[PDB]
Every structure is written in structure tokens, then in C-alpha cells.
Amino acid sequence: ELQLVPFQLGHFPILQRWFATEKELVQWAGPALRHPLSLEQMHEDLAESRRRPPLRLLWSACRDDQVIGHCQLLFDRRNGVVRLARIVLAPSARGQGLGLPMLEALLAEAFADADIERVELNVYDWNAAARHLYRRAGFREEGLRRSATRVGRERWNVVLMGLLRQEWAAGG
Ligand SMILES: CC(C)(COP(=O)(O)OP(=O)(O)OC[C@H]1O[C@@H](n2cnc3c(N)ncnc32)[C@H](O)[C@@H]1OP(=O)(O)O)[C@@H](O)C(=O)NCCC(=O)NCCS
Numbered sequence: 001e002l003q004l005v006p007f008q009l010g011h012f013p014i015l016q017r018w019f020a021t022e023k024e025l026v027q028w029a030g031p032a033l034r035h036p037l038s039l040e041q042m043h044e045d046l047a048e049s050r051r052r053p054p055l056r057l058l059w060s061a062c063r064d065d066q067v068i069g070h071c072q073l074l075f076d077r078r079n080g081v082v083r084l085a086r087i088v089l090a091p092s093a094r095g096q097g098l099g100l101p102m103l104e105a106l107l108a109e110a111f112a113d114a115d116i117e118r119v120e121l122n123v124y125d126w127n128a129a130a131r132h133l134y135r136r137a138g139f140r141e142e143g144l145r146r147s148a149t150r151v152g153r154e155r156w157n158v159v160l161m162g163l164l165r166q167e168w169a170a171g172g
Pocket of ligand 1: 027028029085086087088089090093094095096097098099100127128129130132133
């Protein structure tokens with residue numbers, strides 16, 4: 001069904017189209033982002049993926065040839081922790097139970113290296129869709145970082161969540 005393949009610039013025009021406004025970019029990728037999404041805005045992230053070993057891995061979720069989502073992994077190899085980030089489905093792919101398959105695939109990649117013992121993520125407290133999806137995928141809420149992210153005149157709270165390898169294995 002859904003496949004995760006390495007992200008490539010060849011997929012950038014598809015990805016760029018999923019964000020209509022600055023706010024949608026910020027929700028996805030944080031307060032540094034500006035609309036339209038541009039390759040220049042992704043340079044630091046992509047360079048992280050060219051380090052050896054790689055600090056970030058970027059992924060495109062595809063169905064056959066069609067790019068329908070994006071996700072990232074950030075590696076803390078000293079501690080054996082990976083952070084999930086920048087998870088999005090194309091707007092036309094939302095509401096079709098593709099959220100969970102994408103998370104399950106991403107988790108598989110995160111735990112592929114046997115030295116990873118923990119996976120984690122941040123989610124804005126108001127991002128109810130994302131938060132429920134993460135819980136369904138087996139993530140436990142671990143805390144709430146108050147007034148952490150500045151966006152305009154607002155400050156957003158960040159829910160922290162985590163999943164241990166033995167929990168991930170127990171669930172599947
Ligand atoms: C987060 C995202 C990947 C989820 O996609 P999806 O799985 O199709 O999400 P949906 O819109 O179907 O909602 C998913 C689930 O949450 C539940 N849910 C709870 N509150 C919800 C809300 N406000 N809207 C939609 N679903 C909600 C749904 O019922 C569904 O679960 P169920 O089958 O158990 O009922 C998608 O919304 C997205 O790409 N959003 C924009 C980017 C973003 O916010 N990224 C996350 C942080 S980077």
C-alpha cells in the first residue's frame with residue numbers, strides 16, 4: 001500500500017504544493033518557515049542528511065509513483081534516540097486512514113538500527129489530528145513544554161511524546 005522511499009529534490013515540487021500559507025508551513029516545520037516553501041529553506045536540513053553518519057533522514061511516502069506525504073527522522077546516535085518530525089500527508093490524501101500506515105512505516109525505519117532504543121516527537125498541543133494519530137501509533141504523552149514556540153503574537157505549547165523499542169515491539 002503506502003511506501004517510504006528516500007526524499008529527493010525530484011519530489012520537492014509536490015511537497016511545496018501542500019502548503020498554501022505561512023501558517024500551514026509553520027504548523028508543519030516551525031516558526032522559521034516563510035511562504036512559499038523554497039529549496040533554500042531546506043538546505044540546512046538536507047545538508048544534515050549528507051553527513052556521515054547522517055544527522056537527519058528525509059522520506060517521501062508514496063503510493064506506487066505518487067508522492068502523498070513527507071516525514072523526517074533526526075538521529076541522536078550517542079543516546080540511541082530518534083525524533084520523528086515534519087510528518088505531513090498531501091491534503092488530498094488526508095482522512096483516508098493513511099496517517100497510521102505512514103507512522104508504522106516511519107517507526108519501522110526509526111527502529112531498523114538495533115542501537116535505537118527510543119523514538120520521540122513534539123506536537124503542538126492544539127494539533128488534535130496529529131496528537132490522536134500519534135497516540136494511536138502507540139506514543140505515550142510525556143510532558144507539556146509551556147509557551148515554547150513564538151509565532152507572531154502567540155506562543156504555542158509543545159506536547160512531548162515517546163515510544164520505547166519494547167513497547168513498539170509489543171504493539172507490533
Ligand atoms: C497529521 C496528519 C498527517 C493526519 O492525517 P490523517 O491521518 O488523514 O488525519 P485525519 O485528518 O484523518 O485525522 C486522523 C485521526 O484523528 C482523529 N481526530 C481527532 N481530532 C481530529 C480533527 N480535528 N481532525 C481530523 N481528525 C481528528 C480522527 O477521527 C482520525 O482517527 P480515527 O480513525 O480513530 O477516528 C494530517 O492531518 C496532516 O498532514 N496535517 C498537516 C500537517 C501537520 O500538522 N503535521 C503534523 C506535525 S508536523
